[PDB]
């Protein structure tokens, strides 16, 4: 009623409530430990952005600060909402940035214990209900933009969080890619796609060449999470080229920094995709020897 008076204040349209709104009051606490009920303005705006084609900018801003418990109720539905949004409002690639940020928030949120069991749901989504075709193009686009623009402090933590999410980000990239491929039968531009891969990775290399102080944390985070993607790369790429990429990446490191970090990195590599051995073992190997032999005797 008070907010009615507020709208009645601006809209004096026969707004004279009866006094039977008397002095007496009551107080009630409402808790809802449900499984589908949801209380969030931003979330519902996401659910009728089709009728809120304006505040999508606004919502996007407000999304990353929404409670994850509310969100995980309809994570997949919101994923689809987002995907439709970015298919449709593909015009504002700035909105695509906001999308990128929000979805990073999503998956990072998922990384917490509270939500871990929902990981299958995500892939239950991914392989079964993901329905975006050129999304991966925009994804690689935004990502390479970001890695290029690493000099920003305000994008620095964003890059960090992205590094925290590489597996799933990459997997959605793959899914949009291959979705495009099949729904077009084949890939009229797979070349530039693998390029995008290469220049993205090159941007990583020049990060390694950048001052560590910017992202020492984040450069370690890189060497941590980068090898995660490689096994999905296998599905969509030449392992040999991937291999030489990661090699040159290793040289991209100045030789007195985060030793054990890079060690654990190459551990994560030899872990997997070394299995497709003969075309990758021989070429990854030498570098590993060179560094361990440096690691052998240095005092």
Swiss-Prot record:
The modification N6-acetyllysine is found at residue 224. It is found in: Cytoplasm; Cell membrane; Cell projection, Podosome. It comes from the Eukaryota. Belongs to the DOCK family. Guanine nucleotide exchange factor (GEF) for Rho and Rac. GEF proteins activate small GTPases by exchanging bound GDP for free GTP. Along with DOCK1, mediates CRK/CRKL regulation of epithelial and endothelial cell spreading and migration on type IV collagen. The DOCKER domain may mediate some GEF activity. This is Dedicator of cytokinesis protein 5. It comes from Homo sapiens (Human). The chain holds residues 595 to 893 of 1870 of the full protein.
């Amino acid at each position: 009623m008070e907010e009615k008076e507020l709208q009645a204040s601006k809209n004096l349209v026969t707004f004279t409530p009866s006094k039977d709104s008397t002095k007496d009051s009551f107080q009630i606490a409402t808790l809802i430990c449900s499984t589908k009920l949801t209380q969030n303005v931003d979330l519902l705006g996401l659910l009728n952005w089709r009728s809120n084609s304006q505040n999508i900018k606004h919502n996007l801003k407000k999304l990353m600060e929404v409670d994850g418990g509310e969100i995980v109720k309809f994570l997949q539905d919101t994923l689809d909402a987002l995907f439709n949004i970015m298919m449709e409002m593909s015009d504002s690639e700035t909105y695509d940035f906001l999308v990128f940020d929000a979805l990073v928030f999503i998956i990072s949120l998922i990384g917490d214990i509270k939500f871990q069991h929902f990981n299958p749901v995500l892939e239950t989504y991914i392989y079964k209900h993901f329905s975006a075709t050129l999304a991966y193009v925009k994804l690689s686009k935004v990502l390479n933009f970001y890695v290029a623009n690493a000099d920003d402090s305000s994008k620095t933590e964003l890059l960090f969080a992205a590094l925290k999410a590489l597996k799933y980000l990459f997997r959605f990239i793959i899914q949009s890619r291959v979705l495009y491929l099949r729904f077009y039968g084949q890939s009229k531009d797979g070349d530039e796609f693998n390029n995008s891969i290469r220049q993205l990775f090159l941007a990583f290399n020049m990060l390694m060449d950048r001052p560590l102080e910017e992202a020492v944390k984040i450069k370690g985070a890189a060497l941590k999470y980068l090898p995660s993607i490689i096994n999905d790369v296998k599905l969509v790429f030449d392992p040999v080229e991937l291999s030489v990429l990661f090699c040159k990446f290793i040289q991209s490191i100045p030789d007195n920094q985060l030793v054990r970090q890079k060690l654990n990195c190459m551990t994560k590599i030899v872990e997997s995709t070394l299995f497709r051995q003969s075309e990758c073992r021989e070429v990854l190997l030498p570098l590993l020897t060179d560094q361990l032999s440096g690691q052998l005797d240095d005092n």
